[PDB]
Amino acid sequence: EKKKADIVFLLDGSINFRRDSFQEVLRFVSEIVDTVYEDGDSIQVGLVQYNSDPTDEFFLKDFSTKRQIIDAINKVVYKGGRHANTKVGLEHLRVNHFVPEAGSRLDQRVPQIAFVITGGKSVEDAQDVSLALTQRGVKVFAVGVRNIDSEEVGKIASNSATAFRVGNVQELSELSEQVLETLHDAMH
What value does the CA radius of gyration of the chain take, rounded to a whole number of Å? 15
Listed in sequence order, the residues at least 6 apart from 2 whose beta carbon sits closer than 8 Å to its beta carbon are 40, 41, 42
Q: What is the CATH number of the domain that holds 48?
A: 3.40.50.410
Q: What are phi and psi of 176, to 5 degrees?
A: -50, -45
Sign of the Cα torsion 73, 44, 116, 177 reads negative
The number of residues in the chain equals 188
The CA distances from residue 85 to 2, 34, 55, 96, 182, in Å, are 35, 28, 12, 16, 25
DSSP one-letter string for the chain: ---EEEEEEEEE-STTS-HHHHHHHHHHHHHHHHHHS-TT-EEEEEEEEESSSEEEEE-TTT--SHHHHHHHHTT------S---HHHHHHHHHHHTSSGGGT--GGGT--EEEEEEEEE--SS--HHHHHHHHHTTEEEEEEEEEE--HHHHHHHSSSGGGEEEESSGGGGGGGHHHHHHHHHHHH-
User: Residue 16 belongs to what domain range?
Assistant: 4-187
Sign of the Cα torsion 88, 168, 73, 42 reads negative
Long-range contacts of residues 95-102, Cβ cutoff 8 Å, at least 24 apart: 96/56, 97/8, 97/46, 97/48, 97/56, 97/59, 97/60, 98/6, 98/8, 98/133, 98/136, 98/138, 102/46, 102/59, 102/60, 102/61
What amino acid is encoded at 128 in this protein?
Answer: D
What is the distance of C-alpha 28 from the center of its chain?
11
How many domains, in total, are found in the chain?
Answer: 1
The CA distances from residue 118 to 10, 36, 50, 74, 163, in Å, are 8, 21, 9, 18, 12
- 50 strand-pairing partners: 12, 54
Q: What is the resolution of this structure in A?
A: 2.2
Calculate helix-pair angle for 86-96, 127-135, nearest 10 degrees. Answer: 30
Half-sphere exposure of residue 84, counting CA atoms within 13 Å on the CB side?
A: 26
Listed in sequence order, the residues at least 6 apart from 91 whose beta carbon sits closer than 8 Å to its beta carbon are 129
Q: What are phi and psi of 83, to 5 degrees?
A: 65, 65
Closest to 122 (Cα-Cα) out of 16, 47, 49, 25 = 16
Count of C-beta atoms within a 10 Å radius of residue 108: 8
What amino acid is encoded at 52 in this protein?
Answer: S
Burial annotation 175-185 (CB, 10 A radius, 16+ → b, else e): beeebeebbee
